[PDB]
Design a protein around this ligand. Structure first.
Ligand code: NAG
Ligand code: NAG
Ligand code: NAG
Ligand code: NAG
Ligand code: NAG
Ligand code: NAG
Ligand code: NAG
Ligand code: NAG
Ligand code: GBN
Ligand code: CA
Ligand code: NA
Length: 955
């Protein structure tokens, strides 16, 4: 084995050759000189984080206030119209005229719309009437529905006025308590190719934006009868009913499921109330779908357990509605002592359900439902499950109605996918009360229930339009959260459902992504989250690990967080801004000739002498649309520049001027430096990616192999080389599909830095692609049999070797071609690994299309800053020798080891690719939960409530 001095000399020579080639071919110094030469076509402007955060929060507050005004006006008009309405049953003679969706009878006339095409809504809509959706099980000929249409036909004028006030208005909707939902503008309902599995089961009374406004958060505890007398069809009905009941809960509600058969016990691992999010609800459903019926019944022990679990106060709760929902069939036990012991003051409601078809006594069940301020329900078949499990929100809404005026508060819901194919939206909510005979105080019996719920939608793209990012760098961004910790805005939130567990095969759920799951978790992150949840203002500068856009690299970077609360609402907004992005360049190019030249630069027929130009698809104009092809997008851009005046009445001037300035600088670089040395031996392509959104590859034929995102803010190598302070080598993918490795080369990148007035700016990155053949020629200058020589980057991705068998698989993770060496050096502190979870992932349904899944990812990086390593790879029965050695000014390492053949010891390979996992364990996250702050306004237990109408004594 050669000594360490010769190894150091070899590594020094290789580093010198590689770094010299990259530096001379790229042109970092030339680009920096070109940037600094003018200093008169642009101006440096600061990015004051606090002012930007305050302005964005103010804009968001103003938008939400506008939506709240619209909701209040709609609710007032609806209440006033419903108050003065005459009941009638003569709909045969006089008909109600309305347009119905999901179509194509006496008393109803239908309307044929025009359905023009609109750009905001991604479908065809009409602005002359409001569509009406009536669920399948609701017959549109009944007198209740006819009266509903008759008195709701007055909302169209206020809808039109609302849309005239703010043309950017999205869907407006009134969901009635009778089942029908009237929305504006008119548009046909949804259908998917009329497949047999495309039945419309939509019911507005079950939508979360309706439930969150129909009542207040609760502390439900589902008590399930699992005695022997319930086995059969009724047990299956009970399981389905419990699942449907759990489907009505949200994040603000807390729930647990218990069972009793001569003994009361929990149904799962929780043992107490849990926040009832997607994971906990999935656990509860899976636990309740595995219960068996046996033993005698004992209501006293079960109710004692249910009351005991509601008096904990040692855990996180809601303290707003303690309700016990019993699911049973029948019995003869009333258990007066338990109710007189645990609630003399009727502080806990008891709802009772009799499930199945049987001949058991239902008297004591109704007595339990009527004594406590509860209700009694019957579920004899699967058909009644949908309706007879969402009716408890009428009982829970009586105190809110009795409170009345002080309960008219606009609430905003979670982020969810619109059912009419609009993306990610949030819905405002305001209930409407029934005030007929209010000035005479006559009935006050049917006035304890709400007419319905009104809603208005705001798209997340409207939120993103209020937080511009192109004055920042590719590493700075906004993000906002709600007091539950979930994310309202983030670059890592995608229009996909949240995955739960491993998908096993034989828009209903919300998109709830926590802040600590959209990024890498850290103690400072936890402190910042807890501090901004409580509506504080702060700023914190620290150092943290950042994952690359392509989930294979992790780099250490300095970050700064600045968070303020959004006034009026309950959201908090932050702004992550790296230290080198406190200043930006604005273009002061106000002159015809220079702009004309910089625009002529982009002509597609100049690519011979200007490289293969790309262009980021940005909103440069209102009339310009991102074409997603970039071959005609640049043509449209050139046409607009050629014909439209540079005044830009409807277009940003800053973005256009920035693009022109970057085009001029990049063309100067290409024409003055790259074009001189046309052919370089080891270089296959020379590229440059700028901040304004222009990327260039000099050999026009090399552009066809440039498979990079035209949006320079989405290029992983751009961000990676901005974070690092040296040359960055990017490893090609293993095989995928398409040219690579030998065809393309190896990408080396370096960011340019300028000090124009003592201020650090990084406005571009450049680099080259290296031919594999010449690199191998200079590496051997072997296919040996007793010595292995490999080169890896920070990440363990093989870039070159000497066996000519490793070099065929270039870019593959080194832990799959030589497991023992990688495992050994992963604990010599030369490599460190981070494991994280991704929830918005799709996996092939395994051997239990695609389904949502959770994928665990692992990334590797250099742990200890030591330039040399040594030791012996004693695997047992042999002893290999290795001299791992890093390279300077580069993220590469050089390894020389004994051949694998000499040691028969074979170990298991370790994989860096994502693994379809099922964790983390939910039974542990509830013992030490995160920090949350629930709502304070709670409406319950009003003494004027009648509650004389239970479900038993009336029949
Ligand atoms: C950037 C770089 O290394 N260029 C090299 C140069 O140094 C060397 O003198 C010549 C002879 O092979 O080939 C070329
Ligand atoms: C003030 C008034 O007109 N009240 C009646 C009410 O008694 C009845 O329940 C309802 C539906 O039948 O029709 C209306
Ligand atoms: C807002 C409202 O209810 N207007 C009603 C209309 O529905 C009804 O058709 C007409 C006579 O039938 O009297 C008026
Ligand atoms: C995949 C695709 O549509 N490519 C098109 C190409 O055929 C066309 O020549 C060019 C000009 O508009 O735009 C792009
Ligand atoms: C891929 C690579 O490293 N190529 C360089 C090459 O530019 C240079 O000519 C030679 C000796 O000067 O060393 C090697
Ligand atoms: C047999 C042995 O020594 N195994 C060690 C282990 O104890 C240690 O925790 C790890 C990190 O240094 O490296 C390996
Ligand atoms: C709210 O509405 C008013 C009137 O249309 C408008 O001036 C204001 O700009 C709107 N809010 C925002 C954030 O645009
Ligand atoms: C509002 O209350 C009155 C009086 O009890 C009742 O007749 C009417 O049906 C209620 N409104 C609706 C839409 O049910
Ligand atoms: N946002 C509410 C919708 C879909 C939903 O209920 O999620 C129904 C009414 C009209 C707009 C769409
Ligand atoms: Ca029983
Ligand atoms: Na909320």
């Amino acid at each position: 084995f050669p000594s360490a001095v010769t190894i150091k000399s070899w590594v020094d020579k290789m580093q010198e050759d590689l770094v010299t080639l990259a530096k001379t071919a790229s042109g970092v110094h030339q680009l920096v000189d070109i940037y600094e030469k003018y200093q008169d076509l642009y101006t440096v402007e600061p990015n004051n984080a606090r002012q930007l955060v305050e302005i964005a929060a103010r804009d968001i507050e103003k938008l939400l206030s506008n939506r709240s005004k619209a909701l209040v006006r709609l609710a007032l008009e609806a209440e006033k119209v419903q108050a003065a309405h005459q009941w009638r049953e003569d709909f045969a003679s006089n008909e109600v005229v309305y347009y119905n969706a999901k179509d194509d009878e006496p008393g109803s006339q239908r309307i044929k719309p025009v359905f023009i095409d609109d750009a905001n809504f991604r479908r065809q809509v009409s602005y002359q009437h409001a569509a009406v959706h009536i669920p399948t099980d609701i017959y549109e000929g009944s007198t209740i529905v006819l009266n509903e249409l008759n008195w709701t036909s007055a909302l169209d004028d206020v809808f039109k006025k609302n849309r005239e006030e703010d043309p950017s208005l999205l869907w407006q909707v009134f969901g009635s308590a009778t089942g029908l939902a009237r929305y504006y503008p008119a548009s046909p309902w949804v259908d998917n190719s009329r497949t047999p599995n495309k039945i419309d089961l939509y019911d507005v009374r079950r939508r979360p934006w309706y439930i969150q406004g129909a009542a207040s958060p609760k502390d439900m505890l589902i008590l399930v009868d699992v005695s022997g007398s319930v086995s059969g069809l009724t047990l299956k009905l009970i399981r389905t009913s419990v699942s449907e009941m759990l489907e009505t809960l949200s994040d603000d509600d807390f729930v647990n499921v218990a069972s009793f058969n001569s003994n009361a016990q929990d149904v799962s691992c929780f043992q107490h109330l849990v926040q009832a999010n997607v994971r906990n609800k999935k656990v509860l459903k899976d636990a309740v779908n595995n219960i068996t019926a046996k033993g005698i019944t004992d209501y006293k022990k079960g109710f004692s357990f249910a009351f005991e679990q509601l008096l904990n106060y040692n855990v996180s709760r809601a303290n707003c509605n303690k309700i016990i929902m019993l699911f049973t069939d029948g019995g003869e036990e009333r258990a007066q002592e338990i109710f007189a012991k645990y609630n003399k003051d009727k502080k806990v409601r008891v709802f009772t359900f009799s499930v199945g078809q049987h001949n058991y006594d239902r008297g004591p069940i109704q007595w339990m439902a009527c004594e406590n301020k509860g209700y009694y329900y019957e579920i004899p078949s699967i058909g009644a499950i949908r309706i007879n499990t969402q009716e408890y929100l009428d009982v829970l809404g009586r105190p809110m109605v009795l409170a009345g005026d002080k309960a008219k508060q606009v609430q905003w819901t979670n982020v969810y996918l619109d059912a009419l194919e609009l993306g990610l939206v949030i819905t405002g909510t305001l209930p409407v009360f029934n005030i007929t005979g209010q000035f005479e105080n006559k009935t006050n019996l049917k006035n304890q229930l709400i007419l319905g719920v009104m809603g208005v939608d705001v798209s997340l793209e409207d939120i993103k339009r209020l937080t511009p990012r192109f004055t920042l760098c590719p590493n700075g961004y906004y993000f906002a959260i709600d007091p539950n910790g979930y994310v309202l805005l983030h670059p890592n939130l995608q229009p996909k459902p949240i995955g739960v567990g491993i998908p096993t095969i034989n828009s209903q759920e919300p998109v709830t992504l926590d802040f600590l799951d959209a990024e890498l978790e850290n103690d400072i992150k936890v402190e910042i989250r807890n501090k901004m949840i409580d509506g504080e203002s702060g700023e914190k500068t620290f150092r943290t690990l950042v994952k690359s856009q392509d989930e294979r690299y992790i780099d250490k970077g300095n970050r700064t967080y600045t968070w303020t609360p959004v006034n009026g609402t309950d959201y908090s907004l932050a702004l992550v801004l790296p230290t080198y992005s406190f200043y930006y360049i604005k273009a002061k190019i106000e002159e015809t000739i220079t702009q004309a030249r910089y625009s002529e630069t982009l002509k597609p027929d100049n690519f011979e002498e200007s490289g293969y130009t790309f262009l980021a698809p940005r909103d440069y104009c209102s009339d310009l649309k991102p074409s997603d092809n970039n071959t005609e997008f640049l043509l449209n851009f050139n046409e607009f520049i050629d014909r439209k005046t540079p005044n830009n009445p409807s277009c940003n001037t800053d973005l256009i001027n920035r693009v022109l300035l970057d085009a001029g600088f990049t063309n100067e670089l290409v024409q003055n430096y790259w074009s001189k040395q046309k052919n370089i031996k080891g270089v296959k392509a020379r590229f440059v990616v700028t901040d304004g959104g222009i990327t260039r590859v000099y050999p026009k034929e090399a552009g066809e192999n440039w498979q990079e995102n035209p949006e320079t803010y989405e290029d992983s190598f751009y961000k990676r080389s901005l974070d690092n302070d040296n040359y960055v080598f990017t490893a090609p993918y293993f095989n995928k599909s398409g040219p690579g490795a030998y065809e393309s080369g190896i990408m080396v990148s370096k960011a340019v830095e300028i000090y124009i007035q003592g201020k650090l700016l990084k406005p571009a990155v450049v680099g080259i692609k290296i031919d594999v053949n010449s690199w191998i020629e200079n590496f051997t200058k072997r296919n040996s049999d007793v010595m292995d020589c490999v080169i890896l980057d920070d990440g363990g991705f093989l870039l070159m070797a000497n066996h000519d068998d490793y070099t065929n698989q270039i870019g593959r993770f080194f832990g799959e071609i030589d497991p023992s060496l990688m495992r050994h050096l992963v604990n010599i502190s030369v490599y460190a690994f981070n494991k994280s979870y991704d929830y918005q992932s799709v996996c092939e349904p395994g051997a239990a299309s695609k389904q949502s899944c959770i994928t665990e990812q692992t990334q590797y990086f250099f742990d200890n800053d030591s330039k040399s390593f040594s030791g012996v790879l004693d695997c047992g029965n042999c002893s290999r020798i290795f001299h791992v050695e890093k390279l300077m000014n580069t993220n590469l390492i050089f390894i020389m080891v004994e051949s694998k053949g000499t040691c028969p010891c074979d170990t298991r390979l370790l994989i860096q690719a994502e693994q379809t996992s099922d964790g983390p364990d939910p039974c542990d996250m509830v013992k030490q939960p995160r920090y949350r702050k629930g709502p304070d306004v709670c409406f319950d237990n009003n003494v004027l409530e009648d509650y004389t109408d239970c479900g038993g004594v009336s029949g």
